[PDB]
Amino acid sequence: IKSALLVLEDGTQFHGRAIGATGSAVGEVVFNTSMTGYQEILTDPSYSRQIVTLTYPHIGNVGTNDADEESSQVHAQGLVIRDLPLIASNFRNTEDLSSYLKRHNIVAIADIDTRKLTRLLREKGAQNGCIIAGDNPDAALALEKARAFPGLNGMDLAKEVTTAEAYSWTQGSWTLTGGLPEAKKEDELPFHVVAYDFGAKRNILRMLVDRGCRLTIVPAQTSAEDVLKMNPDGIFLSNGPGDPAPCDYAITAIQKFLETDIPVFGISLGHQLLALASGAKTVKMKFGHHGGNHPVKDVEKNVVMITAQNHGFAVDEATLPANLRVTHKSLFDGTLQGIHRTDKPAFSFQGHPEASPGPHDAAPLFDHFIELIEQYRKT
């Protein structure tokens, strides 16, 4: 028998089985409703310091593989599931879930009532928690660790996951037939985009490459001055963990960009960051949006899109500057989902146009960003 235990800040206990590394894990606890894409989810840097509970009972049905990694490592702090399948069954698999977790040194627990946990988080709101996996899991210790967690509000995590030094990205999207492409050649990409790495997902980069952008991935703290020096065709603000709020450096730099005519586009954290620099305020949601079936209306066109969501903070629509027009809203809760600067070539989306995992409905968000870029090169 391999025990494991999960304890919430409020004292709630969940007893299960250890399916990953031996040890302890602490972080904010969340639930994601994605029936597929667990690997992608686990490898999302945005999940840094969060303990991920999956609502879909059977997690690991397809094992894992490299192409399904959205970053170089597993960023989730811990994984909480209802059931770990006996086997992985998919031509794409290269290593079973449990093995993968152990490899990445992830504390994970299975066999617990994830529905009870979900309903609790929904009703009471997010909560920090601690998973302990080992011979005899100390429930009082776990509760200690959880209660001591500083929490995500006001925590800059973007500076934690970002890249140390700048680098290039010219690799495109995966294909069933060919797999993951060989990185393009610089001369094979018309546009040059500078992307701020706030803990950026690979799919965003790949997709941008798919649309003809050669990329320069820059550390979160990179000054606007340094960027501007590279003569960007466009500036992109990646997704990532924590509160956008405390990221002074980014906001500052962005404001700078906003003085210029360089097109700016941001996704999730980048949306937030954009809104902040534009003088809007960001709030911490009760429980957030974590899943792949979230309806978002494009208010302009009056069309709905099924989207992939992964965020705990939002832009207050009621503090939006007049220079910030609303472009999309959640059909689930009415929360702000998109904005466009009425006076600048800058826009952002709260959701994940790049999906991975999730529906491709929002990818056209990218196209607009290309538009701007094309136009900008016109001038």
Partner 1 sequence: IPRFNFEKFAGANDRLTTQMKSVGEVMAIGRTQQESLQKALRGLEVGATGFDPKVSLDDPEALTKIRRELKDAGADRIWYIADAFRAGLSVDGVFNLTNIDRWFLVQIEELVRLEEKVAEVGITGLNADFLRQLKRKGFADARLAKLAGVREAEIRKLRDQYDLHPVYKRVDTCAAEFATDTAYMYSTYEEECEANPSTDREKIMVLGGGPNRIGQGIEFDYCCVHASLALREDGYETIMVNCNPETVSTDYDTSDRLYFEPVTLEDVLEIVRIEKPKGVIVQYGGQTPLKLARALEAAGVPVIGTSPDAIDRAEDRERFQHAVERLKLKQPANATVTAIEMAVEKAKEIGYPLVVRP
239 binds, among ligand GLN, Cl ion, K ion, none (CB under 5 to 8 A by kind): ligand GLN
187 binds, among Cl ion, K ion, partner 1, none (CB under 5 to 8 A by kind): none
Residue that the structure tokens 């509970």 belong to: 53
Residue that the structure tokens 């994970």 belong to: 108
Quick one: angle between helices 248-257 and 269-277, nearest 10? 70
- Residue 237 structure tokens: 């603000």
Does 317 engage in binding with K ion (CB under 5 A)? Answer: no
Nearer to K ion by Cβ, of 111 and 210: the residue is 111
Q: Binding K ion by CB under 5 A: which of 69, 95, 111, 374? A: 111
Q: Which of residues 74-133 bind partner 1 (CB under 8 A)?
A: 82-83, 85-87, 89, 112-113, 115-116, 118-119, 122-123
- Residue 25 structure tokens: 């894990």
| Residues near 13 by beta carbon (within 8 Å), at least 6 away in sequence | 5, 6, 7, 139
State the nearest-atom distance from the C-beta of 112 to K ion, in Å. Answer: 5
Q: Residues 8-27 vs K ion: string with x where CB under 5 A?
A: --------x-----------
Using DSSP's 3-state secondary structure scheme, residue 265 falls into strand
**Burial of 303 per CB tally in 10 Å (0-12, 13-18, 19+):** exposed
Q: Residues 319-338 vs partner 1: string with x where CB under 8 A?
A: -------------x------
355 within 8 A of 40, measured Cβ to Cβ: no
- Residue 24 structure tokens: 């302890």
Q: Cα angle at 243 between 220 and 70, to 5 degrees?
A: 60
DSSP state of 245: T
- Phi/psi for 355 (5° steps) reads 45, -130
Gyration radius (Cα) of the chain, Å:
20
Q: Residues 241-280 vs partner 1: string with x where CB under 8 A?
A: ----------------------------------------
Q: Which of residues 341-370 bind Cl ion (CB under 5 A)?
A: none
Q: Binding Cl ion by CB under 5 A: which of 113, 186, 188, 333? A: 113
Q: Which of residues 252-271 bind ligand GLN (CB under 6 A)?
A: 268-269
Q: Binding partner 1 by CB under 8 A: which of 22, 61, 65, 153? A: 61
234 binds, among partner 1, K ion, Cl ion, none (CB under 5 to 8 A by kind): none
State the nearest-atom distance from the C-beta of 119 to ligand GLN, in Å. Answer: 6
State the nearest-atom distance from the C-beta of 268 to Cl ion, in Å. Answer: 31
Q: Binding ligand GLN by CB under 6 A: which of 63, 232, 241, 353? A: 241
- Residue 271 structure tokens: 């949306």
193 within 8 A of 233, measured Cβ to Cβ: yes
Nearer to Cl ion by Cβ, of 88 and 121: the residue is 121
CB atoms within 10 A of CB 175: 10
Q: Binding Cl ion by CB under 5 A: which of 4, 12, 14, 209? A: 14
Does 112 engage in binding with Cl ion (CB under 5 A)? Answer: yes
